[PDB]
Design an enzyme around this catalytic site. Structure first.
Site, short mmCIF file in Angstrom:
data_model
loop_
_atom_site.label_atom_id
_atom_site.label_comp_id
_atom_site.label_asym_id
_atom_site.label_seq_id
_atom_site.Cartn_x
_atom_site.Cartn_y
_atom_site.Cartn_z
N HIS A 56 0.79 -1.24 0.00
CA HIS A 56 0.00 0.00 0.00
C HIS A 56 0.82 1.29 0.00
O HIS A 56 0.26 2.35 -0.24
CB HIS A 56 -0.97 0.04 1.18
CG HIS A 56 -1.91 -1.13 1.21
ND1 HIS A 56 -2.80 -1.40 0.20
CD2 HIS A 56 -2.07 -2.11 2.13
CE1 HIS A 56 -3.49 -2.49 0.50
NE2 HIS A 56 -3.06 -2.94 1.66
N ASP A 87 -4.84 -12.53 3.97
CA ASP A 87 -6.04 -11.91 4.53
C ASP A 87 -7.35 -12.21 3.77
O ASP A 87 -8.42 -11.78 4.21
CB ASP A 87 -5.83 -10.41 4.81
CG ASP A 87 -5.06 -9.67 3.72
OD1 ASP A 87 -4.77 -10.25 2.64
OD2 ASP A 87 -4.75 -8.48 3.94
ZN LIG Z 1 -4.04 -6.94 2.91
#
Ligand SMILES: [Zn+2]
Ligand SMILES: [K+]
Ligand SMILES: [K+]
Ligand SMILES: [K+]
Ligand SMILES: [K+]
Ligand SMILES: [K+]
Ligand SMILES: [K+]
Ligand SMILES: [K+]
Ligand SMILES: [K+]
Ligand SMILES: [Zn+2]
Ligand SMILES: [Zn+2]
Ligand SMILES: [Zn+2]
Lengths: 376, 370, 370, 376
Positions: C143, C268
């Site tokens: 990110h 995740d």
């Molecule tokens: Zn993630």
């Protein structure tokens, strides 16, 4: 210089009892903790391993695991019905195996592994595969009786390892120095009538087992004079332990002429331990290890095994354990103990130190120990 | 069955420091804990409150909260720039306000509430609203100096409470008994030259502040003889504290004739505390509370307030705090201390007890209490 | 039995944020957790490592560490003032480096080590020292933008690794497959106008960044057609990912002919993760790894590196990560996933699977993959 | 306005199972956790209580406890041999009582208390001591069968409370709406052939019990048409639940004419729950509570009891639970949900919403439910 074997297995860190608040079983008036469970948690021993890793020490040791203890090895000290009762309770989610001896699911296999690391550490040092060794044996051993689990101990790790070593190598004189802050009652009882094993316990007077001092318990018949208890006053620290080492332990070792020294090394005498009232810092453990290494070098060709026992301060046990291993290996890491200087300032005052020293002089006289100097 | 006010606010349990392993800040060689953070955790104080509720004792107490301490109240002891400094660090997510004094996000407002509960507890007892009181004032107060946070304390709760009480009520003689295992250095410093406040500290010799004993520090000028330090040898337990109470504290209180007694009640002398080396059990704290409640009944019209300070054993502080509150209220719950009998067997032997006793006799004589 | 390098440093597990409850910073209405801090905890990554050790798999891998990323390496993607800003906040005990990007004391040096492991893993595979590699790079990278930390990422680990690889080795075509459940926005942004790096993100439609789908964002100018987003419907599991792999990812890789494949491997998407709503089990991650290892064997000479990204289930990430490493190494341990059978029964029904399948057919057609 | 009873006891927060990593028993390949134990932890429910306190809500409610369930009350649903087996295991440190149903030491007494709070909440509302009630009943009830513990449930709390209420007040028509994300299998089975209890479950299709949908399980014989399952697609959020409430639940309630509505209120449909894949925020729970309160006001004189069931996000369950209680009490605190806006952006897209809506329309038709508007 010096080759130190580090016996370790991650699975020893997976042993876990049911819910406890410190040493208190949860239930009744004892609320389940939100975070920290039983005092004998994996984290104390894990953080030591993690600090060995990040400090660079692990890379300078011979990192080893070992097979679990065989039933043959265990049966030298424990009965088959004890093994069966342990395995059954271990297979049913765990529970209470003895007095202050809770087990979890799969604890049987993990306790066999802990015993196996101790067996293997003594073997490696007797075989000359290393000069000395540190065994991170969780769960611990020093309180376990043949027929009775206690004090967080489920097999008599050191006694199992000694009996195996005698069977395999024929070592005749083993000294066990137990500097865990609690009385090494398991080792004492097993070897109480034996002169082939000198058991010495330094412990806080009356801590665990509760109310036990034991200065007059010096062994019996063939073992008379081959067990020594040094009940130190609660609140003592560095000087109290240094005096004990110099006035009792070193003379006792000199007289006994060990072919192997095993240290039952708990760190629960550290100044912030919840489970005792003593005031050691990492340099105290360093100094005790230096003295015992020297004794091993003079008597036992350097043959020294340190077996992890207690230590219940997550924050501080790592720094103490690291000091022991640095001293065994002769490698000095860049780690600086952040509590050292603080603990120095908290030490007993001169009157308290004098009081403890005088007791130790009287105890040395009572044991009939001559204050000789070290020699070859 | 006396009337005991219990001052508590859930929000005091929401103060939390940055990551620490016991008292060590995370960073360098100190690895972050997998769970167990800073020693001064919510859980010790929360678990007392939980046991008070499950025992039913809470139903026999007068439950109260309080407004946060006003700037006016705080400013009687702390400067405005200290308040500013504290608030700025708090609004920024926390950090190190002083030596061993870490704070977290919102710790400023929560510290004001802690101080407020102490102010209200003294007020209620002085106003006759209760016979005595217990304040669960977290964060604690007894190490904090006017412009220096330390020992996990960020305002001088008791000093702030006393100065507020003096302004509103005009009480002339207050005794502060500090049986937290550490030296009550903040209370000592603030009232060092004063005779209207008798400060007595029982503490482990040299524990915190480290290396400080202090038997000779008896106050100065107008305050000379109105500060008493009893530095107990590390490793002492029930008998050492009973001897200190009988030989020094009670005679000192008798001589001073307090109109209000405030106890800085840390439970960190308990036998399994990580932050000291003393060997008290719940019945020791019960006994000390009975002794001080008696002194308060004799001179102060029963006016006793207990302010919660230290105690870092999650497992054992609940039993010790409950014993105090049972004694204050005169109500005995069904709770049984599961460590008490064990701790009794671990006490100092007779030679060690005698050694400490002779030391206390000599100190009592030095203090002119014979 | 292939040669798999496992890049790991214990010190990556020592990075820890200030107090958080899951992703929420403590303060205001968010009470400090009694134990369980920030979602991006050491424990998820530590427990993978612990299971790798207890299973004996670690003994079949080539264990390696690496130097921290140099300023030179970091500066290929991040400006010097970003490094400065990060370091200052880190030396000050931590805080908020960006949006959902909290750091702790020493997090700067630890983030550099995380980046270094990614750099070394690509290097080792490109240099022929191993057939493939897994890097346990915490904190994560996917990110992070050049001058903006976000999504718990503080350096763009993979981008830094790729730029370093290009400088040292001169690799011309790299494919980055990101099966972390969240959008790999950093990788996408950095390579958006580039054709030498194919970026593919599988992600839960709208999860993080919140509300972002991105199917239409296929790159621009020179990069047009070298970015693929597959926004899967929340609630999808094994079949949804198998269909995305067969219809989009593998055809895309076939068309691009990568010389190296890097996987941004978050776990995740697992069926019990708190930070997404997908239903993968360990055999899904096993299957995706087999599919990508095959693509890498066909075009890249086997050259595949898996970089650990997200995964916030302490209990379940260990089993998923182990499956990946078993597949990379070609070694099957004795470990049996205790949730796998349970998760199989929870999968989308046939109507939901068909619905998602038709959506993937249409997206494949939009991408010109038919 | 509105008088809301809040049934709570601190001892419900002291129930604690042995070591678990989420739902997985520790042992074998499952390492003991360093911090967070079993998913059904005290902390989820504790943090709700703490937020009620600091927000000022607790002060505006009627805070009450209650005696534990009597053996008489429990025996209406559970056999004596089940009670005995539970107590025995509870007295021996705990262990496994059923499938995914671990107990701890003293769990028996705490489970009786949880049941007792539910019994007392229905009693208080039927007696007109309050307009409505919230019972923080831990451990939960919705999965428990008469003869079998499961899904973290050890007594069938709601069924026990209903049977007690029928015995004491003679209520004839009770509706149980279960919006816990898992299937209310205990309530369904117990009342499956009964027309005096309408059981409705909204749940994630196939979540728990695993693989169960149940749309065609509408009850049998006397109970046919008095059980309704709404298996929502995994990944749905606010719109999916609003559509279910409007197309299925409200019509079903209208037809049944409840004299009392009980809500089995789990918060495990929240967008960050580890134990389901749904995307609710606190305003979803607020809206569901508003609709059910309105239904209770139109049919049942306002008689509504909300019983805490699941919810496994320590961070977020507090904000969801708080929204329910605000809606029951008609008091709006200053609390602002810090995840609300974020979760809004993650919601299913219009095509996914359309797909789920169409399924719900078809389901309403299959159940033979007429889309009427609310009336007196
Ligand atoms: Zn993630
Ligand atoms: K010992
Ligand atoms: K002996
Ligand atoms: K004191
Ligand atoms: K004074
Ligand atoms: K992705
Ligand atoms: K690109
Ligand atoms: K349901
Ligand atoms: K029914
Ligand atoms: Zn010990
Ligand atoms: Zn203290
Ligand atoms: Zn549920």
């Amino acid at each position: 210089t010096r080759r130190t074997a580090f016996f370790f297995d991650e699975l020893c860190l997976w042993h876990a009892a049911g819910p406890h608040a410190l040493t208190l079983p949860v239930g009744g008036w004892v609320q389940p903790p939100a975070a920290a469970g039983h005092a004998e948690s994996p984290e104390t021993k894990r953080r030591l391993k993690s600090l060995l890793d990040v400090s660079g020490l692990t890379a300078r040791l011979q990192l080893r695991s070992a097979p679990p203890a065989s039933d043959e090895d265990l049966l030298r000290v424990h009965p088959a019905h004890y093994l069966e009762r342990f395995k059954a309770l271990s297979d049913a989610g765990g529970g209470s195996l003895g007095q202050d001896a809770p087990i979890g699911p799969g604890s049987y296999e993990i306790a066999r592994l802990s015993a196996g690391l101790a067996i293997a550490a003594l073997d490696a040092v007797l075989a000359g595969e290393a000069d000395n060794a540190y065994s991170l044996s969780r769960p611990p051993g020093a309180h376990c009786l043949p027929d009775q689990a206690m004090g967080f101990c489920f097999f008599a790790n050191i006694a199992v390892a000694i009996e195996a070593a005698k069977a395999r190598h024929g070592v005749e004189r083993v000294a066990v120095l137990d500097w865990d802050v609690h009385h090494g009652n398991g080792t004492q009882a097993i070897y109480y009538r034996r002169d082939d094993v000198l058991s010495i316990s330094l412990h806080q007077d009356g801590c665990f087992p509760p109310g036990y001092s034991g200065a007059e318990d010096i062994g019996e018949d063939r073992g008379r004079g081959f067990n020594l208890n040094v009940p130190l006053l609660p609140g003592g620290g560095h000087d109290a332990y240094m005096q004990a080492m110099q006035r009792i332990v070193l003379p006792a070792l000199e007289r006994f002429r060990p072919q192997l020294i095993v240290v039952a090394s708990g760190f629960d005498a550290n100044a912030v331990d919840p489970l005792a009232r003593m005031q050691l810092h990492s340099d105290s453990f360093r100094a005790m290890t230096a003295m015992v290494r020297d004794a091993a070098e003079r008597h036992a060709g350097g043959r020294l095994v340190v077996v992890h026992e207690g230590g219940y301060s997550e924050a501080y046990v790592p720094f103490c354990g690291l000091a022991v291993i640095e001293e065994l290996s002769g490698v000095r890491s860049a780690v600086r103990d952040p509590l050292r200087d603080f603990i120095e300032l908290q030490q007993p005052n001169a009157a308290f130190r004098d009081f403890q020293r005088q007791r130790l002089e009287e105890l040395a006289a009572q044991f009939g120990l001559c204050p000789a100097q070290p020699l070859q």
